[PDB]
Write a protein that binds this ligand. Structure first.
Ligand SMILES: Nc1nc2c(ncn2[C@@H]2O[C@H](COP(=O)(O)OP(=O)(O)OP(=O)(O)O)[C@@H](O)[C@H]2O)c(=O)[nH]1
Ligand SMILES: Nc1nc2c(ncn2[C@@H]2O[C@H](COP(=O)(O)OP(=O)(O)OP(=O)(O)O)[C@@H](O)[C@H]2O)c(=O)[nH]1
Ligand SMILES: Nc1nc2c(ncn2[C@@H]2O[C@H](COP(=O)(O)OP(=O)(O)OP(=O)(O)O)[C@@H](O)[C@H]2O)c(=O)[nH]1
Ligand SMILES: COc1cc2c(c(OC)c1OC)-c1ccc(OC)c(=O)cc1[C@@H](NC(C)=O)CC2
Ligand SMILES: COc1cc2c(c(OC)c1OC)-c1ccc(OC)c(=O)cc1[C@@H](NC(C)=O)CC2
Ligand SMILES: Nc1nc2c(ncn2[C@@H]2O[C@H](COP(=O)(O)OP(=O)(O)O)[C@@H](O)[C@H]2O)c(=O)[nH]1
Ligand SMILES: [Mg+2]
Ligand SMILES: [Mg+2]
Lengths: 120, 426, 425, 426, 430
């Protein structure tokens, strides 16, 4: 079954029927979702630059620690050498003090030998 | 006067646009400089005070490479520079990048140019939109554009021509994702979308044109022949599909089920006897000539139109139509009449000179809304599920500001569509 | 989305960096005086990706050459293409890094790093749209390892949205310059997991083994190893450098090759393997998935590919390329994950590499790369469980737990790789 | 840049320095007035305005005799007079005179001269200290100086070259005491110490060089070639270079384990050409070690090979490949690779009138082996024999020391022996 | 590196004068002080012992001291008498009566300020004073008593300086003065405390050498002093002549004296000759090394093989192979290991000086720190006790103001010395 539909300058159209039928958001909603996505992108970026900043702080803490280690190694060396040098000085001066005192005690004895000679 | 506006998004849409507008200029006798030595062509071409004809088209890409070849190419003078819009950095195959990151930066500009073309219209019908499912711009930006066009032109039709990805034609790992995502976002905004399967087109180029490895030029010229058949109704004073609204009336009885299957015949190799109205006709029901790979006899029909072109006499058509009824068992759903709308458009089919197609005295393109096209969705859905069960690549999308929830929502919509097709073909 | 900025750091980084520029300058027809003398305009189409145009229409690599040591960049300047490089882009310190990652990353590197970042910040402002950064460096030493990863961290802070891509040479006891290579490599793999988007794993263990076993070289030298490395770097970038079917950049590569952020270490391969001085498409396709052709000393048949990129160079029918690549895939189906469809991609380029009428380059993201890290990890633990050579690192201000954190993370990367090896569909 | 400052203490230190600086001036073409007809030698020589090249060296001795021969000898115009520092009275083989009684009167003078050499540096790498274990000055004043340099210069590298006593070569009865005392106080302050067994040098002179009774000039000239190898890396441009930091980190696995064994090859009599493999193998034969011990019964923790002359890296590779196979040569469990290689282009220079033959290529290996503990064991035993009876101790107490320091020094040596035992544990 | 030489008493000035005669000839100095020598090696270390006078002359840095004016005229009479600075002659008028107490406490104390004046003047003319050496006898009164007083006083003023004595030990074979054991025992008391190194020259051994070996029926001081002078020349060789040795008195004391009180050296010499007697054959190196650990060549009357050497210094003089010298010296040590303590490693040192002494083509001097030297101190202590048991001659000493107790203490101290020598003789390395 044919049924004519339309004719025109550059064509015509019709319909052929064989069997009949067996059976008779908003602009603000849009930009709301895009601004939310943009603020998730910027928040993840904030987090990344925060962790990178935390790594910058760690790096300058490592460099500071190496400086402090070197200054504590100088300070330990300095006070241990001072303690050593002054301990040697007190010991060597004591040996000499003792040696001189023994010699001077002998000189006391020799004057006593002399005076004892004058009694006889 | 019934003006239409073409939008070409991303690489695939720009290069199919190139091929169509080339054919349109050949079909209407417009030279590449826009000069021109039936006035229905004015639906697609405006006219300047210098006598030149300018396509009612906007080309959009987030990257300059492809459109720069338009700016410097053979038809460079046909388009005004305003109609060609590029960013500097593409979407890197990432829907959420084209939709949320870059798309937010360039959309108002694109809408401004569209607003301007629409102002040169005394009766705008609406928009034809060209894009790939797979690219980041073609999926991500296109779906943002459709959202906005619905807001700004509510009572206006939008027809999509969408490239469906294929591993044989330079596809990427993440294209199932992009495909499902843009299909979710644009479903409620498109009134009629013609899918083009790159594998189907590639198969047709190989078998009928004898090109072992087709180029993009090859696929896009064959695609333009199909697009031309569908729009010839609008560009010439035809009788079937005279306005964008008629596509919905004739092919889309149910809104979500708006994906018709195109079939074209004949594709004859230029390198290699004229075929009757009856031979090109029964070649409309051979799956080899489908634009999308599916088996329409494992489905049911809701609508069917035959767009003839060239020297086709109505009695031949009815003679062919009666023969295939007895020869072929094709099934319509219960609540639809079993039959066809027929259009003859007297303009001969035109081939690009020197191209790989051969000039023929007659040709036909069949548009059907069949449930069989669901199995193209099933194929994409399955590749989506494989990757999404392991969350593979999802982190690229979350990093652009998309929420992982959008993946499951989109995939639930595709499920609903798959069972929409199930239900109407019960 | 066009220009790449390239950085070579340390002795190794600068050696393979130079050899790279030597290779692509020859492919694009750029002479050492910086001017062009090629015959195809395909050599100029994407020349801006790696080169800047000078006043006298001469081309200048977009390269930044870095070392804490002055010796190697005298050696670069003296090489064949030593004059091609911008004299301003040499950034060299004076002390060296003492084979110590802590010196490169914390103390000596920190005093040179901002001079490097100025040169970087200048070359990137001379870009229309900067695609990303690529870095060549070793992980075994102190400068490329320690300061290189310092650079990457600081470039990421100034260019958060830019792709960072490294070519990282992996130490081996078969070709070692220093006894602390396992510490250096482990501390910087930590960094690369965090802050790069693609890393090409160049394994000296594999380069040495190819030279010895396949190329029948009794005594491999760094010249031999670097011959293989520069071929691979040429092939890997063929699609950035030459026009072709592919309109793709570094970002699209990262998207399609990296399904999970941490799993971004690639096994490079190449065919045919050649010796300095001295095949069929089916054979090319086959030896590309052969263990003997991987620049990472892992057996891919020990794991499964998440994704694979292969590029063929030379005149050859793509129909036969695709047929053999599908045959190989289907023949070896259990070495590809089934939950990533079509995960083997193929590109062809007409321009064959210099000296060869045909070749193929392979980039695979494989769970078998975990064998490389297990190897670094066992050498790490053998030294570290005795705290050997540790005082050279603590002396720089580092704490022990930085070491345990680095191995813990690398052992997590191994188990992460193993988890997808065992994943089903 | 990269300057090194050299300090030569006591007779042994000063006389060895003589041999070394005569060798450097020959290796670089500096005549004895410092005039000269690759600027790496500037690490060891500053230049005055008149073109005079001047060693970055101090010579120190508590007695004027040995340095007076310098002040009047051939090279008397090579050093400025302020670099040659002498007191009036030596330390009489008594550590405590060198470290306290006599040394404390000249130490400030010595640091002020050193400070002035350091002030002419823009990249001071470190200090090299030459001295004997046995002298009162070599032991006691070097200990004072190392303590004071750690205060002035913090953790800056201090490397020692120490002459180890031998009865065959003018040793004295109390030298075991002085050796342990200087080792104790200097452990914390040195970063790397190269010991030269005077008996080993003595034996090389009589076996390889056919000298019945070697003199100091014989011994010291041999020592100079070895020192020259170590420093050649720093004064020449070379193919594979090793600065002072690379030395310390590749050879010193723990702070106290820092006494590498030096080996040199070839040592050919002047009146009598070897392969890279031949000289490399000979670095593992005990006839060529600078300390008497048996590494075949120890374990290697690190090896540093420094080649000079006509050496190709492929040949070093092939030769080290051989060494890795011989399991006569055992490395500890925790050393995955213990090889660092230097190559410099300039062959060893021979002093005219000397006894060594000019060779095209030589090698100096520094290896850290547990077997060097055998040399500490021999000194400790002689210490114990005498100390058990407190023989000679009263000379030290008189100068202000305490017996307390003797057992502490000996206990620290016990712990060092125990450290070398434990690092060879598997 | 100057030394200040003091000689005290008859014996001190006789052997001191002989010393100056011998080294003046060795160094090319004639009795006027002019240098008439062949080689500059004679002059390099000449300042150790001689001052440089204007007029190109050399004056011994010598201080001559005696309480009796007699012997210091005979020193002026002696050849080389005119060589000494006249102002360094410090003499009294009363002798010491062979009485130590006169030397130490009474007559000697009155003269000791004047000798310290000279010592202060000679030593502050030095640029770096090494130390002092004193020649004296222990049996008399001036050398023993005033000599040890001088040492004590020099200790006070120069406590960081080395003190060295050449001390002649009495013997009944040579002198008849019965109180020589008393004087020697009091003197040794002082020496133990206040000197760094003492060479023990035993008149008993000198007598026996002349009588048994030189066959001199009735030896004289001249005969005995020949052996002293040979020895003093020998042990000072390396202070006086540039050789291998970079060393002074303090370096010697550090390596030869392991315990402070045990610093009494046993000198030895080979070959033994009588004075003014042509030698018709020089010894060979084997002969020298052998005859140098032979008890017949010791200058202290102790058999070395009765004890153990703590330390030994051997000085060879002449043109000889240092090959052969170091060869024999090892032999000697190996063949005779049980005579060296094992707990002082490498305790024998050997020096070779090319300059031989006058009259010999080759000689050897030995300095041994041996525990056998206790045989000497026991012999003094036995003689001392045999007198002291009976208080023999005590009033010579108490008449000068001493007390018995001072004698008891010195006997105690010397018995303590003998005890420690035996303690180390019996010590093992176990
Ligand atoms: N038929 C046809 N398909 C094309 C063409 N160009 C690209 N495609 C397909 O489109 C998909 C890739 O998406 P593109 O359009 O190229 O990407 P895009 O929209 O530019 O977005 P980006 O990812 O930013 O590049 C793949 O499936 C291609 O096979 C074309 O010219 N013709
Ligand atoms: N190889 C070599 N060893 C020497 C040299 N001079 C001395 N010795 C050794 O060094 C030790 C002696 O120490 P010296 O250096 O002479 O003594 P000192 O450091 O000058 O200090 P003093 O005790 O004050 O004289 C002995 O073991 C000698 O063998 C030398 O020129 N070359
Ligand atoms: N070997 C040697 N012994 C001597 C010499 N002169 C004296 N003696 C010994 O020295 C001891 C006596 O000492 P003297 O030197 O004579 O006495 P003095 O120290 O000068 O004290 P007075 O004589 O009492 O004034 C006796 O043992 C003598 O044998 C000498 O020239 N050579
Ligand atoms: C800049 O150079 C390249 C860039 C890319 C790819 C690639 O391999 C062919 C390249 O050459 C090495 C690429 C890689 C792998 C893919 O899957 C693993 C994919 O889907 C897709 C691709 C590329 N797309 C296509 C269609 O090949 C885009 C990213
Ligand atoms: C100034 O004259 C001498 C000075 C010394 C020594 C010596 O005997 C060889 C002398 O000649 C007698 C000397 C002595 C003994 C030693 O050991 C017992 C020693 O180790 C060391 C030495 C001497 N040193 C050397 C290397 O012989 C230093 C002290
Ligand atoms: N493949 C290759 N590896 C190298 C080369 N030079 C050094 N290496 C390796 O790099 C590591 C040493 O690092 P190096 O670059 O010399 O130290 P840096 O200057 O501190 O970065 C060791 O694994 C070396 O074997 C080279 O030319 N090629
Ligand atoms: Mg694109
Ligand atoms: Mg000295």
């Amino acid at each position: 079954e044919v049924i004519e539909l339309n004719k025109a300058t550059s064509g015509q159209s019709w319909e052929v029927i064989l069997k009949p039928p067996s059976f008779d958001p908003s602009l603000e909603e849009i930009q709301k979702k895009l601004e939310a996505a943009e603020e998730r992108r910027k928040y993840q970026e904030a987090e990344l630059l925060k962790h990178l900043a935390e790594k910058r702080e760690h790096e300058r803490e490592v460099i500071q620690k190496a400086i402090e280690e070197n200054n504590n190694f100088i300070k330990m060396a300095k006070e241990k050498l001072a303690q050593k040098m002054e301990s040697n000085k007190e010991n060597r001066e004591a040996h000499l003090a003792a040696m001189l005192e023994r010699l001077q005690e002998k000189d006391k004895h020799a004057e006593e030998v002399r005076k004892n000679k004058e009694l006889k | 006067m019934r003006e239409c506006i073409s939008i070409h998004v991303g690489q695939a849409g720009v290069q199919i646009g190139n091929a169509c507008w080339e054919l349109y200029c050949l079909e209407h006798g417009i030279q590449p400089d826009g000069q021109m030595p039936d006035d229905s062509f004015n639906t697609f071409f405006s006219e300047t005070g210098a006598g030149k004809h300018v396509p009612r088209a906007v080309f959009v890409d987030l990257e300059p490479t492809v459109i720069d070849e338009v700016r410097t190419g053979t038809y460079r003078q046909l388009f005004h520079p305003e109609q060609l819009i590029t960013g500097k950095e593409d979407a890197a195959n990432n829907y959420a990048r084209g939709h949320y990151t870059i798309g937010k930066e360039i959309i108002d500009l694109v809408l401004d140019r569209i607003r301007k073309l629409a102002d040169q219209c005394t009766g705008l019908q609406g928009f034809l939109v060209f894009h790939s499912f797979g690219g980041g711009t073609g999926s991500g930006f296109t779906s943002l554009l459709m959202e906005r066009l619905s807001v700004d032109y509510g009572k206006k039709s939008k027809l999509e021509f969408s490239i469906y990805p294929a591993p044989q034609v330079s596809t990427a790992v993440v294209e199932p994702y992009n495909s499902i995502l843009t299909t979710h976002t644009t479903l409620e905004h498109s009134d009629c979308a013609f899918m083009v399967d790159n594998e189907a087109i590639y198969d047709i180029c190989r078998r009928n044109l004898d090109i072992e490895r087709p180029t993009y030029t090859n696929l896009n010229r064959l695609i333009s022949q199909i697009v031309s058949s569908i729009t010839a109704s609008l560009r010439f004073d035809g009788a079937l599909n005279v306005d964008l609204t008629e596509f919905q009336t004739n092919l889309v009885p149910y809104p979500r089920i708006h994906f018709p299957l195109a079939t074209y015949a004949p594709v004859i190799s230029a390198e290699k006897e004229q075929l009757s109205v009856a031979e090109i006709t029964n070649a409309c029901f051979e799956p080899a000539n489908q634009m999308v790979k599916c088996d329409p006899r494992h489905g049911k029909y809701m609508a069917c139109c035959l767009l003839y072109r060239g020297d086709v006499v109505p009695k031949d058509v009815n003679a062919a139509i009666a023969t295939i009824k007895t020869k072929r068992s094709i099934q319509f759903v219960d609540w639809c009449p079993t039959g066809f709308k027929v259009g003859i458009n007297y303009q001969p089919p035109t081939v690009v000179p020197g191209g790989d197609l051969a000039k023929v005295q007659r040709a036909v393109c069949m548009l059907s809304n069949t449930t069989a096209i669901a199995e193209a969705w099933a194929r994409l859905d399955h590749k989506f599920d494989l990757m999404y069960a392991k969350r593979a690549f999802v982190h690229w999308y979350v990093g652009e500001g998309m929420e992982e929830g959008e993946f499951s929502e989109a995939r639930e919509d595709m499920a609903a569509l798959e069972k929409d097709y199930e239900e109407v073909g019960v | 989305m066009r220009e790449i900025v390239h950085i070579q750091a340390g002795q190794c980084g600068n050696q393979i960096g130079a050899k790279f520029w030597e290779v692509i300058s020859d492919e694009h027809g750029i002479d050492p005086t910086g001017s062009y003398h090629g015959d195809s305009d395909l050599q100029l189409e994407r020349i801006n990706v790696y080169y800047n145009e000078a006043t006298g229409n001469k081309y200048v690599p977009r390269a930044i050459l870095v070392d804490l040591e002055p010796g190697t960049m005298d050696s670069v300047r003296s090489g064949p293409f030593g004059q091609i490089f911008r004299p301003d882009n040499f950034v060299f310190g004076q002390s060296g890094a003492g084979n110590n990652w802590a010196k490169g990353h914390y103390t000596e590197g920190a005093e040179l790093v901002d001079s490097v970042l100025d040169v970087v910040r200048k070359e990137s402002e001379s870009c229309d749209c900067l695609q990303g950064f690529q870095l060549t460096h070793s992980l075994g030493g102190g400068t490329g390892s320690g300061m290189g990863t310092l650079l990457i961290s600081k470039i990421r802070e100034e260019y958060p949205d830019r792709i960072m891509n490294t070519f990282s040479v992996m130490p081996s006891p078969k070709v070692s310059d220093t006894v602390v290579e396992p510490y250096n490599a482990t501390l910087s793999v930590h960094q690369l997991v965090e802050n790069t988007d693609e890393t090409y794993c160049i394994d000296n263990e594999a380069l040495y083994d190819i030279c010895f076993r396949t190329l029948k070289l009794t005594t491999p030298t760094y010249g031999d190893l670097n011959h293989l490395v520069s071929a691979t770097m040429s092939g890997v970038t063929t699609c950035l450098r030459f026009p072709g079917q592919l309109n793709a950049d570094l970002r699209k590569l990262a998207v399609n090759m990296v399904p999970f952020p941490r799993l971004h270490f690639f096994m490079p391969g190449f065919a045919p393997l050649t010796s300095r001085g001295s095949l069929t498409v089916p054979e090319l396709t086959q030896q590309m998935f052969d263990s003997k052709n991987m620049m990472a000393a892992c057996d891919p048949r020990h794991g499964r590919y998440l994704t694979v990129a292969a590029i063929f160079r030379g005149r050859m029918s793509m129909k036969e390329v695709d047929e053999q690549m599908l045959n190989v895939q289907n023949k070896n189906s259990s070495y590809f994950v089934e939950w990533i469809p079509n995960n083997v991609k193929t590109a062809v380029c007409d321009i064959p590499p210099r000296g060869l009428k045909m070749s193929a380059t392979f980039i695979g993201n494989s769970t078998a790369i975990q064998e490389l890290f297990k190897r670094i990890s066992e050498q790490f633990t053998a030294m570290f469980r005795r705290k050997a050579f540790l005082h050279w690192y603590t002396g720089e201000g580092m704490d022990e737990m930085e070491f345990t954190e680095a191995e813990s993370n690398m052992n997590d990367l191994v188990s992460e790789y193993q988890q997808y090896q065992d994943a089903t569909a």
